[PDB]
């Protein structure tokens, strides 16, 4: 049930499958595009104690990932590393092919303890964590990420 | 038809990508002589043209829920075929008569 | 066209699936507030429409050999693209030349 939006004359219009005029032209597979945007461009706060409040631990769901093509310059980035009080780790190691965010000016690194209840950390709002051309639903250890969402578009003819 | 409803929207987009470069001259395309992992990106900048960026942010914010619902119903680990499937259905819709 | 030839064929089909749920109300679509690993399935029940359930228990049996041969001639570990290829050939057969 994925919606897509077409762009024409600098005008954006969200269209479904049956609403598709004959004017619409797709002559290559390079017109389809995917772009990931950040949340700090909407006015959301960026302070450290004002964003750790939206991540919570659960156990019982498996994670999933999708892929990216483009990005956007970021002002703030995050890099967490959390341990249990007894000395255990709370976050999973990164798999093969996962790398940090390419372009952002600041990076806030945090190391400390915490009451890890579940197994995976999710976002209480339904958004994504952004890595190098891969957008996930959970948090991997020691990899710089951003916070944002994804969009699918058909580019101008 | 998309009207932004966020408290604010930044009207300037500063973006990066990779592209393909088509042809190269020199010893650039050899992995033994080419760049490192960081250095393959091409940058740009765009200004607001009739609220394109704010509408774009609204569109992403609307899409998130359907994206999550689609992702819940698969057994894979990484997904690369959303656009190819979109093309397949776009082609299948019209060619029946 | 298919005629069953097993000693016994059950005429009742009690199945399960996952579906897509289209749109959801409440906080259910968020993975933080959603169901567990089991709880995403939707059930049903079907009765033996004339020569349909049992005539469907043979079409599977006939298939296996061919499928196995296909799986011998490939290098992938997991396969997800049989139906996409079927659609592509269906599109290519009629729409060409």
């Amino acid at each position: 049930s994925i919606p897509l939006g077409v762009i024409h004359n600098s005008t954006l219009q969200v269209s479904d499958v049956d609403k598709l005029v004959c004017r619409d032209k797709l002559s290559s597979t390079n017109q389809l595009r995917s772009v990931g945007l950040n949340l700090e461009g909407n006015g959301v706060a960026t302070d450290v104690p004002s964003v750790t409040k939206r991540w919570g631990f659960r156990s019982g769901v498996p994670p999933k990932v999708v892929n990216y093509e483009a990005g956007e310059w970021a002002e703030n980035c995050y890099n967490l590393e959390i341990k249990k009080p007894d000395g255990s780790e709370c976050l999973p190691a990164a798999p093969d092919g996962i790398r940090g965010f390419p372009r952002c000016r600041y990076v806030h690194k945090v190391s400390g303890t915490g009451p890890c209840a579940g197994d995976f950390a999710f976002h209480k709002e339904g958004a994504f964590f952004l890595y190098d051309r891969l957008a996930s639903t959970v948090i991997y250890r020691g990899t710089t990420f951003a916070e944002g969402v994804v969009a699918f578009l058909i580019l101008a003819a | 038809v998309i009207v932004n409803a966020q408290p604010k929207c930044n009207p300037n987009l500063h973006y990066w990508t990779t592209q393909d470069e088509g042809a190269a001259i020199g010893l650039a395309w050899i992995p033994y002589f080419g760049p490192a992992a960081e250095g393959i990106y091409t940058e740009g900048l765009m200004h607001n043209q009739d609220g394109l960026i704010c509408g774009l942010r609204q569109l992403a914010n609307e899409t998130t829920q359907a994206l999550q619902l689609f992702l819940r119903a698969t057994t894979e680990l990484r997904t690369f075929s959303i656009l190819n499937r979109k093309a397949i259905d776009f082609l299948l819709q019209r060619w029946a008569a | 066209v298919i005629v069953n030839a097993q000693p016994k064929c059950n005429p009742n089909l009690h199945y399960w699936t996952t579906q897509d749920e289209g749109a959801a109300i409440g906080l259910a679509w968020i993975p933080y507030f959603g169901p567990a690993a089991e709880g995403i399935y939707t059930e049903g029940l079907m009765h033996n429409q004339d020569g349909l359930i049992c005539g469907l228990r043979q079409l599977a049996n006939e298939t296996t050999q061919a499928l196995q041969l296909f799986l011998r001639a490939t290098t992938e570990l997991r396969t997800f693209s049989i139906l996409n290829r079927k659609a592509i050939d269906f599109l290519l057969q009629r729409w060409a030349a």
Partner: antibody, heavy 124, light 105 residues
Framework: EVQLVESGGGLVKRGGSLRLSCVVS????????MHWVRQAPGKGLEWVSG????????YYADSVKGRFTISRDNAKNSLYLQMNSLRAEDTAVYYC?????????????????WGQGTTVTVSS | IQMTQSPSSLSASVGDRVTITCRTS??????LNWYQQIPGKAPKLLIS???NLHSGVSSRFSGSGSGTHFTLTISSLQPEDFATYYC????????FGQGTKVEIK
């Protein structure tokens, strides 16, 4: 000032159908989702259905599923509800309401501005 | 989910304190809203998320609670504050309350 005006209520025969409209002036209609609520004579409040900003998500209640249809129009700032196969329990006063969008499509409504309401009754 | 309210009806005089409760059959964190309706008038919004006062509402009203216990409080009566109160939830499919009418002695 947020102003909402309802219209279409009246008296109909059993087994019939009806259409209600809600018109809003004061702000940008195209950035918010809308919902419908009802109250029977001397009874409590009940939620009927709701729509989204791009007309991509539609919701219905079990008691009216398969009988009611919702729609909206951003250009003319209008909201429409179509009711079919009318029963005895469908005599009430109806309101159109707006919410603060804490969710992605209108999943978690928090009504902040209400209308006036219209009366619909069906009997012999 | 089932909604419970107590007391159902009440009569009070000017200068007292009014304390009301709303109850549910599940644990829904803090997704609760309170509404007030005057007979012959449409309902009106009040404190949201069980403690967030709206804009233009007098500071006398105050709500609190979480989990399965939620209490609304009015500190000083006023002649135009004799009407009905409702609670509504949004964790799952919407469902209003049963109502409560305050009166005079």
């Amino acid at each position: 000032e947020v102003q909402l005006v309802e219209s279409g209520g009246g008296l109909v025969k059993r087994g019939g159908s009806l259409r209600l409209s809600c018109v809003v002036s004061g702000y940008t209609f195209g950035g918010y989702s809308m919902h419908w609520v009802r109250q029977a004579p001397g009874k409590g409040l009940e939620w009927v259905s709701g729509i989204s900003s791009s007309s991509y998500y539609k919701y219905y209640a079990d008691s009216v599923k398969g009988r009611f249809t919702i729609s909206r129009d951003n250009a003319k700032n209008s909201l429409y509800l179509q009711m079919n196969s009318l029963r005895a329990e469908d005599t009430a006063v109806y309101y159109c309401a707006r919410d603060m969008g804490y969710c992605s499509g209108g999943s978690c409504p928090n009504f902040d501005f209400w209308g006036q309401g219209t009366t619909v009754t069906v009997s012999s | 989910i089932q909604m419970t309210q107590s007391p159902s009806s009440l009569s009070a005089s000017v200068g007292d304190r009014v304390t009301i409760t709303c109850r549910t059959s599940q644990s829904i964190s803090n997704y609760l809203n309170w509404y007030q309706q005057i007979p012959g008038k449409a309902p009106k919004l009040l404190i949201s998320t069980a403690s967030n006062l709206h804009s233009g509402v007098s500071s006398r009203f105050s709500g609190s609670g979480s989990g399965t216990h939620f209490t609304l409080t009015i500190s000083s009566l006023q002649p135009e504050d004799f009407a009905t109160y409702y609670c509504q939830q949004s964790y799952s499919t919407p469902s209003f309350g049963q109502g409560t009418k305050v009166e005079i002695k």
